[PDB]
């Protein structure tokens, strides 16, 4: 007598990274980065109309 | 402990362009300018048919 069990193929995904910028919705925002955000307590921006 | 008082950049400079030749409507229109006017009482347009 000869018997098997068998493992056939093994499949995944691939997570695809996203960078934001190969959107072509952030036309909408000028997106800049502050290295330091957490320790300003002031968030006034100047307008000039 | 770190305190900031952060403005921004002032990203707003509103700009007006105005020339009375760019707009078309100076087609409809006769200017002539005197270099000094308001001595004058009446000017007159003489028409003859």
Chains 1, 2 share one sequence.
């Not at 925002?29 to 921006?45: I, S, W």
Request: aromatic letters at 12%; hydrophobic letters at 45%.
């Amino acid at each position: 007598d000869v018997e098997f069990d068998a493992l056939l193929g093994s499949y995944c995904n691939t997570l695809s990274l996203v960078r934001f910028l190969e959107l072509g919705l952030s036309v909408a925002c000028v997106c800049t980065k502050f290295p330091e955000l957490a320790y300003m307590n002031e968030g006034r921006v100047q307008f000039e109309v």
